[PDB]
Design a protein around this ligand. Structure first.
Ligand SMILES: [Mg+2]
Ligand SMILES: [Mg+2]
Ligand SMILES: [Mg+2]
Ligand SMILES: [Mg+2]
Ligand SMILES: [Mg+2]
Ligand SMILES: [Mg+2]
Ligand SMILES: [Mg+2]
Ligand SMILES: [Mg+2]
Ligand SMILES: [Mg+2]
Ligand SMILES: [Mg+2]
Ligand SMILES: [Mg+2]
Ligand SMILES: [Mg+2]
Ligand SMILES: [Mg+2]
Ligand SMILES: [Mg+2]
Ligand SMILES: [Mg+2]
Ligand SMILES: [Mg+2]
Ligand SMILES: [Mg+2]
Ligand SMILES: [Mg+2]
Ligand SMILES: [Mg+2]
Ligand SMILES: [Mg+2]
Ligand SMILES: [Mg+2]
Ligand SMILES: [Mg+2]
Ligand SMILES: [Mg+2]
Ligand SMILES: [Mg+2]
Ligand SMILES: [Mg+2]
Ligand SMILES: [Mg+2]
Ligand SMILES: [Mg+2]
Ligand SMILES: [Mg+2]
Ligand SMILES: [Mg+2]
Ligand SMILES: [Mg+2]
Ligand SMILES: [Mg+2]
Ligand SMILES: [Mg+2]
Ligand SMILES: [Mg+2]
Ligand SMILES: [Mg+2]
Ligand SMILES: [Mg+2]
Ligand SMILES: [Mg+2]
Ligand SMILES: [Mg+2]
Ligand SMILES: [Mg+2]
Ligand SMILES: [Mg+2]
Ligand SMILES: [Mg+2]
Ligand SMILES: [Mg+2]
Ligand SMILES: [Mg+2]
Ligand SMILES: [Mg+2]
Ligand SMILES: [Mg+2]
Ligand SMILES: [Mg+2]
Ligand SMILES: [Mg+2]
Ligand SMILES: [Mg+2]
Ligand SMILES: [Mg+2]
Ligand SMILES: [Mg+2]
Lengths: 122, 120, 114, 56, 209
RNA sequence: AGGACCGAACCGACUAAUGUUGAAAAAUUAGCGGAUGACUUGUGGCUGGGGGUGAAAGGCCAAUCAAACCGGGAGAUAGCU
RNA sequence: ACACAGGUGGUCAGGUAGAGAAUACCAAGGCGCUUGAGAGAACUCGGGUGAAGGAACUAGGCAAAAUGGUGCCGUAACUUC
RNA sequence: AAUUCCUUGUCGGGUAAGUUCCGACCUGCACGAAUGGCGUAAUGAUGGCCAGGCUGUCUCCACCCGAGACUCAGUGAAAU
RNA sequence: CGAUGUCGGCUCAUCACAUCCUGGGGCUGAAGUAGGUCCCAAGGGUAUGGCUGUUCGCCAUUUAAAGUGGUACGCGAGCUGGGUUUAGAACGUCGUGAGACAGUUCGGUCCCUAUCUGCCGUGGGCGCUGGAGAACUGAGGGGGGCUGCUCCUAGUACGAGAGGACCGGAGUGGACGCAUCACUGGUGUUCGGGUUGUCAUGCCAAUGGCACUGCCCGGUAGCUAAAUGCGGAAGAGAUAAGUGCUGAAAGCAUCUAAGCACGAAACUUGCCCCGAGAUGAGUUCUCCCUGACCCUUUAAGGGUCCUGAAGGAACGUUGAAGACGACGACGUUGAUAGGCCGGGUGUGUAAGCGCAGCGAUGCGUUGAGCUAACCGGUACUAAUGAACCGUGAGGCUUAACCU
């Protein structure tokens, strides 16, 4: 349930530490991104020698949210914070090379197969 | 918007309702019959009859509880000592309403509510 | 309603082992890992139980790699292969939601032992 | 918001088209005391359906 | 084909072998008993009329009882007509079971939606509320402006305004039939249907593919 | 020690909602400034209308004030309605 | 103008908690405010709580929400010290 | 610039994006020395701008407790 | 000019089409992809932000698109009051000065209880020709009508290659709408618990009152969205622009003159809702009523006596029905409501007693006690025969049967 102005932690060695969502892509007037949806972010905080720098503007797939994900049997998987993984603009595809914290199987998404293949849990 | 909701707000707030019905189960019990508006009478049955029920079992717990509601020992004396054993074998409906016309000063529908045997 | 019970309890499990909020359970859950069905383990503290017949459920909280993961299971879903009590927990409160405001050390809950 | 023209007496009439009261037609007489009373209501001497309930 | 009348029992769920929770509306479908057939000849159209359930005799009227009597079926809570369709044929007194649907696959379900009483514009029409704050005077949930100016100089018919919402006929189309159990008078359809628990429903095979 | 600080009474009146045929011809409620000082208040006194008084706004001078109120000139005058 | 939510100087200062004449609860004393009875629609007023988000509102964070005590530790620029 | 018309001047900063803000430039339409000039610690219910927290301000509204509204009884207005 | 308040915003919209997107089509300096231009088309759809009072604009980032206009430059008895914005004040500039600016700057009261029209809801009356209960037919009216992306066909047609389709099919989304409460949650001042301060119930223990429900932690039913189900259609008809067949007028040509085939989100249908006050008041099924008298201007006349059905309605118990009316359930041959029993659920181990400890407090009895609107049962309580309204066989004419 991410929207414009939402802050997210990063889930990769991209160097971004805090990003802010400035657009929920994927449809006119579309209001929320969650599950594994692709938002557009600006970067509010990065480390000193990272692959990205603060004030950069690219995209990211969201991979963890406080709202979580429902499953075919009713159950829910929630997360304590909201996290995404930076993708570069004209390719989606992740900038980082490693992934942190758990991710959900919804990512099965062909193009995010990498993310799951990295990344500790679920 | 009410759907399936019980309980009558009697144009009061929660505490006041509680105070009044406490103050009025004690009345009906003391006098075995009292005259009130019809709505209050109908609600009274929900406060009072479960005191009676409670009194069908004498125990230090139940008396104390009875005292928590009511907060008056004469009355918790009467349930338990008299009323509990009266209604010992009757399953509920310890009370009965008799409608009885209209209040002069404001036209409120009145009714007597009385214990089912009185004699008093 | 009498029909509905008929329908519901003919769909309920008759071996949900006992547990209570504070307990630490390991839930084994069927999942399709790529091409494979296979059991998979989720272990954490039961911080809430919703008791409602076929709809009964429990929320199991667990600190995965630095931050929390809560999942609520649907006690009677075929997805839930088995439930196991790894440690009897001693708390007093139906819903242990205060543990969210707790990290690592303050999070710990006495063992029940008894 | 107030009227621009005075409404007519006829209109006053029509508006009161529905405030006739209705007389009751439900009085019954108690079998055991012969006082009138409304259906399902007690009598003024406290009779109801023959038995003398109340007693005030 | 024709449809039956039933009662909305409640909702629950059917868990599926492969870990899916299908949410279902439990509809009771006691046998429907034909109380009148109609044809071109006599009525100008073909259809069955049916009753279902039972009615306290003291609450059946002379006229109703007359009618029921004729078809020689016992009174039900009501009567409902289903349009016959060139081919379909039925006889007075015939009993129709829920097994009518043993297939069909989807069904349209009609009920009388729960009753929300006098609803304002926000609820009834999803009107979006004004500022709570910033100066608003007695105008949060109010409905805004309702016209233009001299031109119209009136309000247009069908204007979205506050009033009764709920408690009207509503159809919900193409719901999956999940189960048909005649022995039990059960029709399980996937998803919620109109009306509070206990009220009448009409199930017809879904008209749309 | 202090036209010192925080803060009740007391003095005030920055914001908002309510009220606007008001509970009230200026207020209520929540917040707000001063609160030993150029403070605040009781009683009585003095200044009078081209006059007063004014840490000055044309403020205030009995629900009012770029000239009070009352009575008079007076039926001012009204090429206007 | 009203049996008007306004205005009106002074004196008195009980108990518990409290720095306190704040504040909560009480004592003495005084009161329930001169239409009531029911309903539990919209909408208005006054409050409580609110998933995820967190100023994206708006002229403006207006309004809310938030902070809030005591004692230690400890506090930058700048400075008329 | 409480002063600048042209003007959202130009450049820099801050923002994802800043007709405002800050720092600069000097082309001051039309600053300037007790009609005081330029500074200035502290003070300020003073104006402008940023940020942390905070939130129903907002996405986008839900639910609940209360005074009206609504029904009965009594009284009984108003503008026009 | 004895008052037609205003820029922008908010809310709500409604038309036009000179069409922004989606649809059809002609030409193209159209290979494909993607464009250009024009014709047809108004069914639906048609952005959030930074800055500024702004509209606009510029900028950032979306989108299929971010249309242009009219509606007192739509909309202040609907909100706002930033701009405009009287009275205070200041700068600059003008003026000897009072002052002034169509320069700037800081501050700065937005009334109105709806009679009529209109509109949204909802009743009462009468009518529909004896009266009544139903179920209908369907004239008419309203709703709805949007679209991305991926996959197949196919790396195919096309192309030197880059790239990359038409037609058709399959999925899965966005926004929107409806319903629903099963799930996930919110709330849940009527359920349970903890706790601060104080007062009371003599005291202890145990309780209750007040302090925003004192403050909090949870939470049943219900309501509910963020929750989960469904929708937009396919099809059919007649068309627009357009593409054509046959074909003369005009030995040819010609889509047209006669004749014929096609052709779009527009139209009529198909889908949903209302719907016989459709006074052109329709149809079908069922139900009820089988006494006499008097008078007058003697006629579809007025009255009286007796009668009083079907049904309506009343009264009570009431409802996921509700402002009130209304609608539904039930009224003893009874589950309608309350109570009562059992169960669930919530809370989370009451009180009391005992044991340990100096004590706070622990442990045991104990998953205890309590537990609303819930589920399954149960006549204990309340739903008394009755009253009232509505009648007593139903006009004339013609026709077809019928004696
Ligand atoms: Mg109920
Ligand atoms: Mg009242
Ligand atoms: Mg309702
Ligand atoms: Mg809004
Ligand atoms: Mg106001
Ligand atoms: Mg308001
Ligand atoms: Mg006109
Ligand atoms: Mg001082
Ligand atoms: Mg104040
Ligand atoms: Mg002070
Ligand atoms: Mg004096
Ligand atoms: Mg004055
Ligand atoms: Mg003069
Ligand atoms: Mg004079
Ligand atoms: Mg003279
Ligand atoms: Mg004169
Ligand atoms: Mg008084
Ligand atoms: Mg007074
Ligand atoms: Mg005090
Ligand atoms: Mg009183
Ligand atoms: Mg709050
Ligand atoms: Mg919230
Ligand atoms: Mg939160
Ligand atoms: Mg934050
Ligand atoms: Mg904005
Ligand atoms: Mg903004
Ligand atoms: Mg504020
Ligand atoms: Mg506050
Ligand atoms: Mg500057
Ligand atoms: Mg900003
Ligand atoms: Mg100067
Ligand atoms: Mg100076
Ligand atoms: Mg209320
Ligand atoms: Mg009245
Ligand atoms: Mg006027
Ligand atoms: Mg056109
Ligand atoms: Mg051209
Ligand atoms: Mg205008
Ligand atoms: Mg106004
Ligand atoms: Mg201004
Ligand atoms: Mg709930
Ligand atoms: Mg004690
Ligand atoms: Mg008290
Ligand atoms: Mg209270
Ligand atoms: Mg030819
Ligand atoms: Mg219909
Ligand atoms: Mg129980
Ligand atoms: Mg039951
Ligand atoms: Mg007769």
């Amino acid at each position: 349930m991410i929207q414009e102005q939402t802050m997210l932690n990063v889930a990769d060695n991209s160097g971004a530490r805090r990003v802010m969502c400035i657009k929920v892509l994927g449809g006119s007037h579309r209001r929320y991104a969650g599950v594994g949806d692709i938002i557009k972010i600006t970067i509010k905080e990065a480390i000193p020698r990272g692959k990205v720098k603060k004030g950069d503007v690219l995209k990211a797939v969201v991979v963890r949210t406080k709202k979580g994900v429902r499953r075919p049997d009713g159950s829910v998987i929630r997360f304590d914070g909201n996290a995404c993984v930076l993708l570069n603009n004209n390719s989606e595809q992740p900038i980082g090379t490693r992934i942190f914290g758990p991710v959900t199987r919804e990512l099965r998404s062909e193009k995010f197969m990498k993310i799951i293949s990295l990344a500790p849990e679920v | 918007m009410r759907h399936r909701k019980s309980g009558r707000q009697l144009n009061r707030n929660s505490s006041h309702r509680q105070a009044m019905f406490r103050n009025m189960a004690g009345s009906l019990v003391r006098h075995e019959i009292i005259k009130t508006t019809l709505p209050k009478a109908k609600e009274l049955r929900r406060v009072v009859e479960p005191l009676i029920t409670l009194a069908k079992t004498d125990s230090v717990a139940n008396r104390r509880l009875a005292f928590a509601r009511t907060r008056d020992n004469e009355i918790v004396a009467k349930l338990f000592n008299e009323l509990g054993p009266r209604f010992a074998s009757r399953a509920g409906g310890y009370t009965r309403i008799l409608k009885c016309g209209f209040r002069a000063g404001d036209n409120a529908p009145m009714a007597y509510i009385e214990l089912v045997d009185r004699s008093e | 309603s009498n029909i509905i019970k008929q329908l519901e309890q003919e769909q309920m499990k008759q071996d949900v082992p006992s547990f209570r909020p504070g307990d630490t359970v390991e839930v084994k859950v069927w999942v399709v890992e790529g091409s494979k069905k296979r059991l998979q383990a989720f272990e954490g503290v039961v911080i809430a139980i919703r008791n409602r017949g076929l709809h009964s459920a429990f929320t199991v909280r667990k600190i995965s790699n630095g931050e929390g993961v809560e999942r609520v299971f649907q006690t009677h879903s075929p997805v839930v292969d088995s439930i196991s009590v790894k440690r009897r927990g001693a708390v007093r409160k139906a819903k242990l939601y205060y543990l969210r405001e707790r990290t690592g050390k303050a999070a710990r809950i006495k063992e029940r032992l008894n | 918001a107030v009227q621009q023209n005075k409404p007519t007496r006829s209109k006053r009439g029509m508006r009161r088209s529905h405030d006739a009261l209705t007389a009751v037609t439900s009085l019954s007489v108690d079998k055991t005391s012969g006082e009138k009373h409304l259906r399902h209501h007690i009598t003024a001497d406290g009779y109801y359906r023959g038995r003398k309930v109340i007693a005030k | 084909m024709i449809g039956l009348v039933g009662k909305k029992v409640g909702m629950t769920r059917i868990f599926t072998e492969d870990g899916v929770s299908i949410p279902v509306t439990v509809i009771e479908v006691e046998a429907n008993r034909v109380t009148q057939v109609k044809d071109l000849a006599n009525d100008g159209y073909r259809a069955i009329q049916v009753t279902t359930g039972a009615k306290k005799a003291n609450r059946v009227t002379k006229p109703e009882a007359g009618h029921f009597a004729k078809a020689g079926v016992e009174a039900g809570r009501g009567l409902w007509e289903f349009r016959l369709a060139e081919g379909e044929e039925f006889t007075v007194g015939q009993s129709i079971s829920v097994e009518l649907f043993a297939d069909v696959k989807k069904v349209d379900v009609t009920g009388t939606s729960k009753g929300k009483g006098f609803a304002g514009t926000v609820k009834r029409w999803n009107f979006r509320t004004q500022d709570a704050t910033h100066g608003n005077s007695l105008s949060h949930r109010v409905p805004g402006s309702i016209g233009q100016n001299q031109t119209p100089g009136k309000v247009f018919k069908g204007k979205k305004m506050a009033g009764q919402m709920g408690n009207e006929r509503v159809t919900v189309q193409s719901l999956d039939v999940v189960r048909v159990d005649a022995e039990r008078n059960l029709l399980l359809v996937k998803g919620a249907v109109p009306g509070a628990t206990g009220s009448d429903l009409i199930v017809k095979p879904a008209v749309k593919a």
